[PDB]
Design a binder for this molecule. Structure first.
Ligand SMILES: Cc1c[nH]c2ncnc(C(=O)N[C@@H](CC(=O)O)c3ccccc3)c12
Length: 167
């Protein structure tokens, strides 16, 4: 039993809700919140911009130190950093950005990072400003993640399409 509330069960381990991931993180304080990161950990907009804003820019400060030490992530890769006031940890995961020409096949590699964590609160990777079809992203999530994932979909209209169209 965990604290996540109001989710629709899609499979044994994948759950979905129409919700704002920032507000959901502040309410649940999960062990892991996933950020929709880029390789530079520049959290300017989309999910990343919103999560960073909610930390009063502390996520960005920590991220800049991480990059100065380690260099950029790989597309499809991840790193674990602090969750600040939102969660114990933030798993920064880089899905391919279609608006940069990046191979959509890397979306599966990106979701594989979730399997290193027993339970996570997450967005659909490569959705929103990353330009991928959220229906495809959901299919990859369900077919790749084996740990317990609680997916937050900000847009009410998109959520209904994902549910109503889920196979
Ligand atoms: C851009 C942005 C800023 N802050 C955010 N917080 C959470 N999500 C998103 C985002 O891009 N969402 C996508 C996917 C989803 O509905 O989850 C979406 C799809 C259709 C219509 C609107 C938005 C953002």
């Amino acid at each position: 039993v965990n604290s996540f509330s109001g989710y629709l069960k899609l499979t044994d381990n994948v759950y979905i809700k129409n919700a704002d991931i920032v507000e959901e993180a502040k309410k649940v304080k999960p062990t892991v919140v996933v950020n929709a990161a880029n390789v530079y950990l520049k959290h300017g907009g989309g999910v990343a911009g919103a999560l960073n804003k909610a930390t009063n820019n502390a996520m960005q400060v920590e991220s800049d130190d991480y990059i100065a030490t380690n260099g950029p992530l790989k597309v499809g890769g991840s790193c674990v950093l602090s969750g600040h006031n939102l969660a114990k940890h933030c798993l920064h995961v880089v899905g391919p950005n279609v608006n940069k020409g990046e191979d959509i096949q890397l979306l599966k590699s990106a979701y594989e990072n979730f399997n290193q964590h027993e339970v996570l609160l997450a967005p659909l990777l490569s959705a929103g400003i990353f330009g991928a079809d959220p229906i495809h992203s959901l299919r990859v999530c369900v077919d790749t993640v084996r740990t317990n994932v609680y997916l937050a979909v900000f847009d009410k209209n998109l959520y209904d399409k994902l549910v109503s169209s889920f196979l």
